């Protein structure tokens, strides 16, 4: 039936994707040795979307872990659930793309295209008819932002009628890691906006801000941050593998939300995210899912939506919903937030019924939103890049491999055209 | 040595010589709240966190999973039986 092709790119895409197959194997009940446990009908009834039978009774994920530095995927071997992936599903690396978009994309990643596009078209043609692509890749480093977008250009240009999907983590304005932030940020974006179906953003310091207040944890590691993102990954394709009253396809989500081809950028939330010290204080009800999800500080991207206005958005509930308590209350949040929603679309908001909840919950919700609140996050990308570019700094390592002054200005002008298009639609 | 009004509490430190032997570590608590409002063991009771990780708010599992069609579109006389146990008429 439906198939989704997963691709992990960069250091971040490997760690985030590792916890994706952590939680997806928890939904369908796969023992990490490959076999199944859980003895339920609907766990594996639609299993071909993320798994292939391997004539041993085990379910190999349809994922391709892929980078240029072998260490961060060697830790996937040492970590839990590293045995599900096929050894052929790994594209090795020796030199290591050292945070350079020029090194990842043009020069050193070119000889690895012949191995990663060979394995993604092999797994694509192995099924009857593909549904969509899904990736996880970073915009801060080089092996994710430069060499990950390499895969985006070929896969779109050889499967044009299909769709694709990205989980893109962005550089941060407050915390500064990987000093070459805005070069990788701008160079990934202008290529992305011409070869991607829909892109949905993740911010690091919004993930720390969630884990500080709403989760209320003192000091956990990055494993908790990947647990939130894997909750969103489980949600956004829950109906592709589980039934529902009011279903949701990944391209149903595309048609119902994207107005215009140039803007396809979304903001992601997930609820409930509450501390265990308040689980007895929380009697789980449909309205308190909705007011939590319409909270600016719940968001996984740290762009404040009170400054902007929502254009259109979709809420996807999971579990057993009294669906009129879902959708007239979904009217009721439109009515109080009249100044938070755009005027020329009646019914800006969409409702969805996934009939299966996640682990440990009776009901949850996954938020996706096409908003004009991303233009401030793209505005200090412009301010960072212009400061990098005012008198020819930091970029001679790029031009030592074949970059041009001609093309960096096109990266700036295309993305300033995009923040312009968000600005008029307010 | 208690019949002669013992005045030195040094005899209670011979057995907990290292203080890290876990016998006197947090063994007593004598504030007025725990001496007026306190029952047999409802102070040192562990709290239920989760069994499916941080995403698990409480215990539901996949054994409680039935879709809306499979739950209520069931054969009729079985529903006639199980509503008879709970006031069908």
């Amino acid at each position: 039936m439906r198939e989704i092709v997963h691709v992990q790119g960069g250091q971040c895409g490997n760690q985030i994707g590792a916890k994706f197959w952590e939680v997806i194997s928890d939904e369908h009940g796969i023992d990490p040795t490959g076999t199944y446990c859980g003895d339920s009908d609907l766990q594996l009834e639609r299993i071909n979307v993320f798994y292939n039978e391997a004539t041993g009774g085990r379910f190999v994920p349809r994922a391709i872990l892929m980078d240029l530095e072998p260490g961060t995927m060697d830790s996937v071997r040492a970590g839990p659930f590293g045995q599900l992936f096929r050894p052929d599903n790994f594209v090795f690396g020796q030199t290591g793309a050292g945070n350079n978009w020029a090194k990842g994309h043009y020069t050193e990643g070119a000889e690895l295209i012949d191995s990663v596009l060979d394995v993604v078209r092999k797994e694509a043609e192995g099924c009857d008819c593909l549904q969509g692509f899904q990736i996880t890749h970073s915009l801060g480093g080089g092996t994710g932002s430069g060499m990950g977008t390499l895969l985006i250009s070929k896969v779109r240009e050889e499967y044009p009628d299909r769709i694709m999907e990205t989980f893109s983590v962005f550089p941060s304005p407050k915390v500064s890691d990987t000093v070459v932030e805005p070069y990788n940020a701008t160079l990934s974006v202008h290529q992305l906006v011409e070869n991607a179906d829909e892109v949905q953003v993740i911010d690091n310091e919004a993930l720390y801000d969630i884990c500080f207040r709403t989760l209320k944890l003192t000091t956990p590691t990055y494993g908790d941050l990947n647990h939130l993102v894997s909750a969103a990954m489980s949600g956004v394709t829950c109906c592709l593998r589980f039934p529902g009253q009011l279903n949701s396809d990944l391209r149903k989500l595309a048609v119902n939300l994207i107005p215009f081809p140039r803007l396809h950028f979304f903001l992601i939330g997930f609820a409930p995210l509450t501390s265990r010290g308040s689980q007895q204080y929380r009697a789980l009800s449909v309205p308190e899912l909705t007011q939590q999800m319409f909270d600016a500080k719940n968001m996984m991207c740290a762009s404040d939506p009170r400054h902007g206005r929502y254009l259109t958005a979709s809420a996807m509930f999971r579990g057993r919903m009294s669906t009129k308590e879902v959708d007239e209350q979904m009217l009721n949040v439109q009515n109080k937030n009249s100044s938070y929603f755009v005027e020329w679309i009646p019914n800006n908001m969409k409702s969805s019924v996934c009939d299966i909840p996640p682990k440990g919950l009776k009901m949850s919700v996954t938020f996706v939103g096409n908003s004009t609140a991303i233009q401030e996050m793209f505005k200090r990308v412009s301010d960072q890049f212009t400061a990098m570019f005012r008198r020819k700094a930091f970029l001679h390592w790029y031009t030592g491999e074949g970059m041009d002054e001609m093309e960096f200005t096109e990266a700036e002008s295309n993305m300033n055209d995009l923040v312009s298009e968000y600005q008029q639609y307010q | 040595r208690l019949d002669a009004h013992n005045d030195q509490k040094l005899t209670s430190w011979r057995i907990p010589h290292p203080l890290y032997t876990e016998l006197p570590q947090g063994s007593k608590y004598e504030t007025h709240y725990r001496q007026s409002y306190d029952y047999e063991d409802w102070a040192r009771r562990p709290v239920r966190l989760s069994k499916y990780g941080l995403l698990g708010h409480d215990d539901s599992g996949a054994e409680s999973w039935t879709t809306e069609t499979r739950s209520e579109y069931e054969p009729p006389r079985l529903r006639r039986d199980q509503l008879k146990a709970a006031g069908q008429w």
């Binding site: 209320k216 944890l217 003192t218 956990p220 501390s275 265990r276 010290g277 | 947090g26 709290v47 966190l49």
Partner: peptide, 22 residues
């Protein structure tokens, strides 16, 4: 800012005691 063990009632101590007791 000094950080102490979960016994002390400085900063948070309820949910700070549960995932990593100390």
């Amino acid at each position: 800012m000094a950080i102490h063990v979960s016994r002390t009632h400085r900063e948070d101590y309820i949910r700070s005691l549960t995932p990593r007791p100390a």
